[PDB]
């Protein structure tokens, strides 16, 4: 290229050093100690006893060669509360007579159609621990008498069985392990203000005995502790269970996993962020605390919190730190979690219904924010070091402006420009023979550096010509040789890319598999057994 001479037409300087901000090397975090609470989805489970008399009434046609069961009528009948506390508890015996009401009439059944007697409750043969039963007879009385007549006999079997009882929210009923549903709150009482609970029976059905000592029917050992014993007579049994107040045995919030080294991130303005590196989750709550007077039955979320915040306060941080407030901070987190947080200061320093989903959103929020905060810190340092490197390099670009001032214009602009040093500012200006054979060969064209031909001789009279080098020896041309060997001061930075990873669906158990667990399925058993009369009999035919 040919270079015209620069004039004083257009001047320009170099850009000076420039300032640039700093990365945020400090966040407003608060180390603490926290426990987490979820929705209680588990029912209220308690122990109970059932007392009934199993009455079967069998009728037999007695033939000459055989006997045939005509009727077999089984009814279960309640044992009165006076007989629970005066013969079963005192003596371990039960009368062989059942008096009960049925079709609004007082009716009576006698065992073996005989006079009543007290019979000892013996244990069942199949009695295992937790599923213990007691019964008076092992026989079912049947009268098989003379030929040609019907004969009816009556068995009365007094059964005492230890059952488990379950109650689900709002605790207006409970169900026994026999399958029986009791339409009454298990927290009902006629005393100490427990009468506002739901009773679905007559007042004569219910009865409560204060200062009761349970007597075990195998060991005949009265218990050391007393209890208030509720009694309820049903048309089919009497259930007996221990009374406890509702607010002491039931919460709507259940304890989930604890967090030893919880950090309360307040870097994002307007919200809190509870990060546990041991759980692997970050929970985002608001600033205002939860009012635990608004949640129904949420009263153990603060006494079980402080009993376990303090229980590991005396295990990890006692010599190095102290708590603050003596009442933990209770927050409603995103997704339905209750974060009972307690700060940890240094030694040198209309009800609400809470429904809890899954915690998969908090694992992603932990994983994203921990990889966000590192790549913003890392790339805020390479930005701060690139800004500083270009400032100290500007001293080197100014020193090659006093000597060879035309190289700094070619590098800064891009086109092969020519600059002259006009004091402290630069002015920019934007038939080929081989050579004359007789320092630099700048004589005539038909020759400085970087293929720039001068319009004069300026030397004392290799050289690079185009894409070649012309060799001279004692000021005489030889050949246009090439050089393959090249030195390079360029540092290399080979940065690859993240390859794409596809995430196919992957579940350990599917929905059909997780519902096919259990011996019996009630919807499949019923849609086979209610087809029984249509499958093995003829309903649509009518005799005449």
């Amino acid at each position, epitope marked *: 290229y040919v270079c015209p001479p620069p004039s004083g037409s257009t001047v320009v300087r170099l850009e000076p050093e420039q300032a640039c901000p700093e990365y945020s090397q400090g966040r407003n975090f608060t180390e603490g100690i926290a426990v987490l609470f979820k929705e209680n989805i588990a029912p209220h489970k308690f122990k109970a006893h059932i007392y009934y008399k199993n009455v079967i009434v069998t009728t037999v046609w007695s033939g000459s060669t055989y006997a045939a069961i005509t009727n077999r009528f089984t009814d279960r009948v309640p044992v009165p*509360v006076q007989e629970i506390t*005066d013969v079963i508890d005192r003596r371990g015996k039960c009368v062989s007579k059942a008096e009960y009401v049925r079709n609004n009439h007082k009716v009576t059944a006698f065992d073996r159609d005989e006079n009543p007697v007290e019979v000892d409750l013996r244990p069942s043969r199949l009695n295992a621990l937790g599923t213990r039963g007691w019964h008076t007879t092992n026989d079912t009385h049947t009268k098989i008498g003379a030929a040609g007549f019907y004969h009816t006999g009556t068995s009365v079997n007094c059964i005492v069985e230890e059952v488990e009882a379950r109650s689900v929210y709002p605790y207006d009923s409970f169900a026994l392990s026999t399958g029986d549903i009791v339409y009454m709150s298990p927290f009902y009482g*006629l*005393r*100490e*203000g427990a*009468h*506002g609970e739901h009773i679905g029976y007559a*007042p*004569g059905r*219910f*009865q*409560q*005995v*204060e*200062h009761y000592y349970p007597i075990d029917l195998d060991s005949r050992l009265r218990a050391s502790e007393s209890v208030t014993r509720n*009694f309820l007579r049903t048309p089919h049994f009497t259930v007996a269970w221990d009374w406890a107040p509702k607010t002491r045995r039931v919460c709507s919030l259940a304890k989930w996993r604890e967090a030893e080294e919880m950090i309360r991130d307040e870097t994002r303005d307007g919200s809190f962020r509870f990060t546990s590196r041991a759980l692997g989750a970050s929970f985002v709550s608001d600033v205002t605390q939860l009012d635990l007077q608004r949640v129904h039955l949420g009263d153990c979320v603060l006494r079980e919190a402080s009993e376990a915040i303090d229980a590991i306060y005396q295990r990890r941080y006692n010599n190095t730190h102290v708590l603050a407030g003596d009442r933990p901070e209770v927050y409603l987190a995103r997704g339905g979690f209750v974060v009972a947080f307690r700060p940890l200061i240094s030694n040198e320093l209309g009800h609400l219904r809470i429904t809890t989903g899954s915690a998969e959103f908090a694992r992603l929020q932990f994983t994203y924010d921990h990889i966000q905060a590192h790549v913003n810190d890392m790339l805020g340092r390479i930005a701060a070091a690139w800004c500083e490197l270009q400032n100290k390099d500007r001293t080197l670009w100014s020193e090659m402006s006093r000597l060879n001032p035309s190289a700094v214009a070619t590098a800064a602009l891009g086109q092969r420009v020519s600059a002259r040093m006009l004091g402290d500012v630069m002015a920019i200006s934007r038939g080929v023979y081989v050579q004359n054979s007789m320092s630099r060969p700048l004589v005539t064209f038909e020759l400085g550096d970087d293929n720039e031909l001068l319009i004069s001789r300026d030397l004392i009279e290799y050289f690079k010509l185009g894409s070649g080098y012309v060799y001279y020896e004692d000021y005489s041309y030889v050949r246009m040789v090439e050089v393959p060997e090249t030195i390079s001061t360029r540092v290399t930075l080979n940065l690859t890319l993240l390859e794409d990873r596809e995430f196919l669906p992957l579940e350990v158990y599917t929905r059909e598999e997780l519902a096919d667990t259990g011996l019996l399925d009630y919807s499949e058993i019923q849609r086979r057994n209610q087809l029984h009369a249509l499958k093995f009999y003829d309903i649509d035919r009518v005799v005449k």
Partner: antibody, heavy 122, light 107 residues
């Protein structure tokens, strides 16, 4: 019929001790609790406490924890109330009442005594 | 203790007038139990379980109420019904009787 025969009027000097009886007839004595009430002259009824004459459990009032003790013999079918450390504010008619050994809807003082006039004077 | 404040202390009714009396409880109790006492006699059970009448009491006595408000009303008052009437609870320790309503038949 159910009858709760109770003791007689007793003039007793201050600082002494009085045992007041209540004899039952007409029911099985050992499966009903026996309660005691107090009625000063011209005023209302105050509950002392009870005794269960099968488990010998006594539950009493906190105003009468140091002024009354309750005992029952199983033979003579009687209940007793021992009033001690007497004051002139302990002059009343003291009744004896029958109550069930459970708490149902029909648990009430179904049969009463006839009263013992107690007088603390000189 | 549960205070059982009986509003009409003395009540003067005329034989034939429907007269009510109310017992006000401090906290909520399960049931209320009414007792009648005359001068120089033991108390007598009169209404149990807030609405059930005892043995040998005329049907003109009827009681109603729930929670902290209870009431005893007489349909047609007679001269044999002049006595004092006590409401009573056992829902808490100690058992507490009310104040008393002296009914005076204004003849």
């Amino acid at each position: 019929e159910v009858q709760l025969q109770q003791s007689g009027p007793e003039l007793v000097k201050p600082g002494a001790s009085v045992k007041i009886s209540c004899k039952a007839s007409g029911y099985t004595f050992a499966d009903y609790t026996m309660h005691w009430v107090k009625q000063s002259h011209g005023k209302s009824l105050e509950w002392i406490g009870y005794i269960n004459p099968y488990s010998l459990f006594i539950d009493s009032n906190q105003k009468f924890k140091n002024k009354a003790t309750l005992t029952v013999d199983n033979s003579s079918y009687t209940a007793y109330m021992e009033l001690r450390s007497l004051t002139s504010e302990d002059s009343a008619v003291y009744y004896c009442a029958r109550f069930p050994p459970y708490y149902g809807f029909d648990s009430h003082f179904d049969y009463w005594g006839q009263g013992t006039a107690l007088t603390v004077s000189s | 203790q549960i205070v059982l404040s009986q509003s009409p202390a003395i009540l003067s009714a005329s034989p034939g007038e429907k007269v009510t009396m109310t017992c006000r409880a401090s906290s909520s109790v399960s049931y209320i139990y009414w007792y009648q006492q005359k001068p120089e006699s033991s108390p007598k059970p009169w209404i149990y379980a807030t609405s059930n009448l005892a043995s040998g009491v005329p049907g003109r006595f009827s009681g109603s109420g729930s929670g902290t408000s209870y009431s005893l009303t007489i349909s047609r008052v007679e001269a044999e019904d002049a006595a004092t009437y006590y409401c009573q609870q056992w829902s808490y320790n100690p058992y507490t009787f009310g104040g008393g309503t002296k009914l005076e038949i204004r003849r």
